[PDB]
Amino acid sequence: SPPESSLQSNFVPSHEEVGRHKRFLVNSRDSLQGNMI
Amino acid sequence: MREIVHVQGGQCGNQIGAKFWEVISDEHGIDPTGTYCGDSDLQLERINVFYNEATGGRFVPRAILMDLEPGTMDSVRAGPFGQLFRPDNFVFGQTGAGNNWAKGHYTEGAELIDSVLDVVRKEAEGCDCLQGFQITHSLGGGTGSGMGTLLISKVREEYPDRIMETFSVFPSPKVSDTVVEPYNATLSVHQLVENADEVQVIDNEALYDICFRTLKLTTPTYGDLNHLVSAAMSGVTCCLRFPGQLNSDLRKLAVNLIPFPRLHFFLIGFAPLTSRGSQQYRALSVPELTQQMFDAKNMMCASDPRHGRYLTASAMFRGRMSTKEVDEQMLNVQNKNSSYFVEWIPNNMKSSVCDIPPKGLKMSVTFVGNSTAIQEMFKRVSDQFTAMFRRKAFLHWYTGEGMDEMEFTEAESNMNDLVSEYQQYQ
Amino acid sequence: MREIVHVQGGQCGNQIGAKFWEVISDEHGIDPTGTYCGDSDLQLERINVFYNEATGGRFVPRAILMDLEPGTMDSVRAGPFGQLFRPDNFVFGQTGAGNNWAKGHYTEGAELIDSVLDVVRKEAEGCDCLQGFQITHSLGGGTGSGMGTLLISKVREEYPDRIMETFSVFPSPKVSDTVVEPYNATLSVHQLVENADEVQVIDNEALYDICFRTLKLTTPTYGDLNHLVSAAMSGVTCCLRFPGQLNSDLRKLAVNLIPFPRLHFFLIGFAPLTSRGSQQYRALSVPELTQQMFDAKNMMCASDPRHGRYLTASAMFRGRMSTKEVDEQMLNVQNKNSSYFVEWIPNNMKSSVCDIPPKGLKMSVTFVGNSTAIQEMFKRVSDQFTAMFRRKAFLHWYTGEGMDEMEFTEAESNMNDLVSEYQQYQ
Amino acid sequence: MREVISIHVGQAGIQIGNACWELFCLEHGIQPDGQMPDAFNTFFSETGAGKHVPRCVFLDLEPTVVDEVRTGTYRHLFHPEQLISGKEDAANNFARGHYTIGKEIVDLSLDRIRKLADNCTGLQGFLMFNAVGGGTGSGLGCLLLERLSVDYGKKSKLNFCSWPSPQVSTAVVEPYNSVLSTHSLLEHTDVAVMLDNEAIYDICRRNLDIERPTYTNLNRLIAQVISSLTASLRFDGALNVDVTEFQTNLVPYPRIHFMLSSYAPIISAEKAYHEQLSVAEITNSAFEPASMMAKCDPRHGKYMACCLMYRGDVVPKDVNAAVATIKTKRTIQFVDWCPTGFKCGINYQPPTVVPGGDLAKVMRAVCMISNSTAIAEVFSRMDHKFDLMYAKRAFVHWYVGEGMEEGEFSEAREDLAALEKDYEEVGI
Amino acid sequence: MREVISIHVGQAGIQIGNACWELFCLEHGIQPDGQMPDAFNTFFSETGAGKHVPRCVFLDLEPTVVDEVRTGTYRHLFHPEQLISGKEDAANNFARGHYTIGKEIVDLSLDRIRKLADNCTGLQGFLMFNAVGGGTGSGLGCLLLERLSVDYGKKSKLNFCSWPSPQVSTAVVEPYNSVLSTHSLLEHTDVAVMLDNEAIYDICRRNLDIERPTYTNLNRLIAQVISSLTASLRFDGALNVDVTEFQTNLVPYPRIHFMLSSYAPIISAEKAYHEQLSVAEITNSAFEPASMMAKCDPRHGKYMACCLMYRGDVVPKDVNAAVATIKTKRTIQFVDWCPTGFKCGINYQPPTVVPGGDLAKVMRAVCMISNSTAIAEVFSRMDHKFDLMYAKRAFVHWYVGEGMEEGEFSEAREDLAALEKDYEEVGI
Ligand SMILES: Nc1nc2c(ncn2[C@@H]2O[C@H](COP(=O)(O)OP(=O)(O)OP(=O)(O)O)[C@@H](O)[C@H]2O)c(=O)[nH]1
Ligand SMILES: Nc1nc2c(ncn2[C@@H]2O[C@H](COP(=O)(O)OP(=O)(O)OP(=O)(O)O)[C@@H](O)[C@H]2O)c(=O)[nH]1
Ligand SMILES: Nc1nc2c(ncn2[C@@H]2O[C@H](COP(=O)(O)OP(=O)(O)O)[C@@H](O)[C@H]2O)c(=O)[nH]1
């Protein structure tokens, strides 16, 4: 088997690439105009 | 119609500009997936000022993410409203400017400035004619100051007749971060004073002082300081997005705040501002809207305007309200504070009515004012820059990355001349 | 009515035309077993231009599968849409050309070209009247460059007045494979310049440039790049199969691109081309189509048109679209980019409207342009050829097949006078 | 994308390196096989089924510590020629490191570095660990830095070299080995960070009340330091600190890059059950001279620059309140030409505790690296006990008879004397 | 239709045919009886009911290595008369091996090479594996190459000649045998490739880390070379390279047909799963000067052509990306009359590892055959060794009285110096 086509007839790529992340640790923040809890 | 072009540079600009697109998507009823909800005429009758219809029905922001390291680009797309932006608006560096001016301005910001003007021209020439450029970045670091302001140099050459609106966050006097700050700050200031049509100043000392006294939070983070800048930056552009009894725009601010083009530095205020302890106890009306807004505690610069003199100023009133109590109260604040207002200018105030109030409130105001009290943090930058430069400390980076020495002597002399010309009008 | 005969040679050509007969099968509703699907009258009103009715219900291609080695033709047949082609339209070689123009053109290209002339005479004379030929091959190899171009020669003599429209892929100069490329490149140009009516240049690093910058493909295979140029092959012939408000033809391209018979070398662009991380973000309109098409990033020839002058150009649009914007956009780019558009021709470029767009897209555009920037591509192939022929390298595989040195110098002369002829029009 | 190469020369580098990489394996989740039951990229590579092999070389001229790593637990984590070994020890000699044994091992060493660097662009720099008192840690450690400057010119090169004590040195010819290593690393090292063994012994005795720990317990505490330096390179945080501003914020002059460190909190589980861990007091502990990392008193030294690396659940508000407290504090004095004196970097990941170790699970920590004028005294005591033994030709016949000539001692003597004059001139 | 004929002479040729056909039987599914439980048509011919039969001749005048093959496991696979045996050893003698004792075995060998190459037209070429230092490898190899040149002149003549090393020569009269053999290797051999023993000795010593390797492990590496040689000929690929492509892309002058070889990766199981052996990490090791399989140092030579063949799941994106960094590095250099020097072949099927051998199951591999000006050095010390021992008539009486004449040595001396004058004439 040769490698398959990675483009549809719509002429766009077929599979995504997961971006190189940074080990996202979230931060809980919200303020002003009610400013939560 | 008109088109505000936003550019979002540096680590600091990428967080304060992301929170900006959280609240403008709030004001226009935009979902984080790009669609629309809310069912109102007033949310999208003027939507081309900040958004583009992308033939998927979504409203992509006309804002470009711009940094020399993908650490901040990773964060702004992982969180909420990161799906709103286009990945082609993101421009990536890989090396990173380690808070050095020549690092971003001469060596490795030179090869990414060709790619980022390609995306500026992609969205500028795609419309008929735009209204202005809105430049948020950081002068304390490197990728915001040096790599940021050569963009300011280049787009002014291509579009000299358009307005040049910059919101720059300054080094702060009390907190000591990014220890080579006075080199980055001074080398950006003298070059943007001949280049930017008008500049507004944000300092993290003043945003902390707001959370000390007016918001009375206990643990304010950077996201809380972001929405302080973001609520003010929404308010300064609200009349271009919404109707009103008295319409205005950014060059209305420019013609009504700038008697001389060398002096174009402003202070920002924003009222009302309380926590829930005073949300139901304070009469939301025109007296304390104007009177909190003329307070040093509410100022977003680390300056006391009581020290200086208000040369010119403007107020951006938002919401359905009585209009006498807007402008006659600014006549009373001029009569009571006649010593605080400059003597050869009668009616220092520009006013406008932006009849759609912001979300969650019914009355608000945004301050943009040219005060000669903005001299004082140029003085403390001058004192600490010449403290580092009289014995040439931390200089070998700024020499070895292709940048000369008399470029620094003209940098100090230009800003000293800017300080001296603010004295003669006080 | 008319018929365009695809003649498809070299191991590059057979696998770049397998993807060509996949896209015109998809656009025309051809099941790979041969039967029609999709029950649309516009989708089969013009079939006789590329397919012939088989009196068994199927639509056999008018394709001339051509190679000197029996391997790539077996892989094309074994793949999908490879059982569409007539088995007798394949012509088989048993020895092959070893990237050798001598055995490609003279010795091993002679005993097989008598069978190719038999099959191309059989299908063409069976038609009522021809429209042209579509020569797709490679110049960096042995069989496509060797007797694909001798096939170009003799059907030009035997058919003197028809159209000969060739998609030839030049050798990739930056990252060069098949080390004796400039012998097969330069010395097949000077033969082809008096025997080809219309030429389009394809470069492999340009095909990698559009896969990297505009498609952001992580792993681009040959199937991707053969699929991208088949967008050009279908977009250039859209009006041959489909109606339009303004019509065209390959003859229209001939009469509206060359003011002189020698300058038939063209560049090719295709728009739109975006990833699906930015497909929902793409506003798809006529002004955004033309400006993204008019970039060296998008053009599938590896020559910079900013260093040259577009002497003549053309733009086939596709899709239901307004016909004031099918010209006011080119008045915008001619007035803005007048430095890149030559003066002694007024209004350098034409357009036509095809009504059916490619499937999945509502509008598209292909571009065939006679730009004088190709002088930097022939002179760049020149400095490898004159350096490798000065010191007599790899020449005994050439002179040892009924051959001498005189037409190598004639190749240098007949190509550098094409370089110098493009010199006088920049 | 991002990657950093760690080089460990000498058996001091070996023992600091095995504990440094066992924390990284427990920090990202690498089993002793190199599998993950994505910040590994900045310290661990990839090769298919989770195989996250390390990006570090291990130089030693003698095999007696390297091949017992091969025999030990971490066999298949490390690539086998990343562990590079000779046959004979340099045995406390600068000449034995350079000219007789090191010339035959440095060709294979740069062969492995070149293959391990050209795998992907994005190399921030090299982290050097060595012993200046030793033979291969100072001699071969010099010649690696000579061959790294000639090819990898513009790349950053951090340094963490174990300076000997005024008292605990366990050698006699470390006066020769150390000051010949200075003539190496004034002009080849970009940022030099100083270490000292009794300055880790007195932290283990006082801050954890551990009366009999060993060399390996020193190596956990320093492993926590290097992991905190690369905290922002791997994990996310509010203020990113990569390697390029360890030098442009802490090095004011190219010949002034010798600098100090400190770590806090170093608190056991039996003391963390009573003391509250606030950001204000962990940085107050990092400013105490008794909590210092290389035994250099900063009362007579004058802080030119500093860096703070907060790691954990540190809110930026009390970062700025605590650092304003030390400007008010008079006993930590700073320089008049550097009024601002601080670069702050916040990372959200808490410090990773090793079970069976010495530390507990704390929610916040500081890694402070400060360039101060106090580094003048650590070389002035080097002045006094070098001239006290060089004056009567003691231990000189080993050096002169083994390739290196007399006179290189005198120019390296004038080199560190010039370093003394530079630190006195900048400290006015 | 398509077939290739291998030819082996000498004891070295016989066991180098045993390794390359232990491998080719193991990848084509060929049991030692030949029964499958159309890509095989190059090396095996369909005979009867599902039997595949070797396409070669095994040639040796001494029976001591060949009749032990016909009593072995592969004895019902091979045809009996394809293995042709003599009666007496040539005994390091060009005079006997060409003239005296080698003339009664050529009539059987040319009968079988006719009966094997006449079954189908379109024969792809002949391969030759000879021992240069041997007696029948040099003598019989020369004369039958002469007779196959007059019979089949227009067919390819591949050769992988096993040359004596500068220090490893395992005999005494290698100056006579090799210089006499290269007089005719120059004139009627279309392709020559040097396989020096000590170079492949070193490669097994450091890459595969076997410090007692034997001629078996030497022979497996050549088997991997010939497998990735004709991988494109046997199986399909992204870009085919034919055997005719070799001379058209590596031989710019008919006299210069002497090229090099290199195989990478040759990693061992233990060291295998420890590197992402990527289309680059493996093409950098293929171009490494010490990874040479004939110990011709190319840093003092100029590359005049190079052919790379990839074998596995190789995308050509990083083929072009990695070969660009090969082109840009200045430690490699090309002669200016070949601005490009690269012919690439791609085969989809990965190489197959032999059980119990010394390689590992590797997904992608590179074999690289480069023509260079650095062939002048293997003939330059050949000049030194021949004249140093021809000076005083050593071993001359074994050649003069056994068929040749005094003066063959002078002209074989002369035309090798003509090869040197021709190589330096390219070398400006
Ligand atoms: N902190 C720490 N210091 C060590 C360690 N091992 C050795 N040292 C220091 O190194 C000095 C002795 O030199 P070594 O490192 O053992 O020798 P070397 O640098 O490998 O060079 P050679 O003497 O040739 O083996 C001692 O005085 C210690 O200060 C260790 O595991 N941890
Ligand atoms: N590459 C390779 N060469 C070998 C091998 N075995 C022997 N040789 C070469 O063969 C040479 C000696 O000749 P032999 O092959 O033993 O004997 P021969 O070719 O039959 O010729 P005679 O010496 O007359 O018996 C040595 O110089 C080696 O270089 C092997 O396993 N691999
Ligand atoms: N206004 C504002 N300032 C910030 C924010 N985050 C950090 N800062 C300030 O910016 C300085 C660091 O800037 P830096 O990120 O290095 O700028 P960069 O070079 O553009 O990345 C610190 O002194 C902070 O006080 C923010 O979210 N808003």
Ligand SMILES: Nc1nc2c(ncn2[C@@H]2O[C@H](COP(=O)(O)OP(=O)(O)O)[C@@H](O)[C@H]2O)c(=O)[nH]1
């Ligand atoms: N665009 C394109 N180029 C190809 C393709 N296949 C091979 N090539 C290029 O063609 C050159 C080899 O010529 P080739 O077609 O194989 O020789 P030929 O079949 O005898 O003409 C190589 O440099 C490849 O880069 C293909 O499918 N598409």
Ligand SMILES: [Mg+2]
């Ligand atoms: Mg030693």
Ligand SMILES: [Mg+2]
């Ligand atoms: Mg022999």
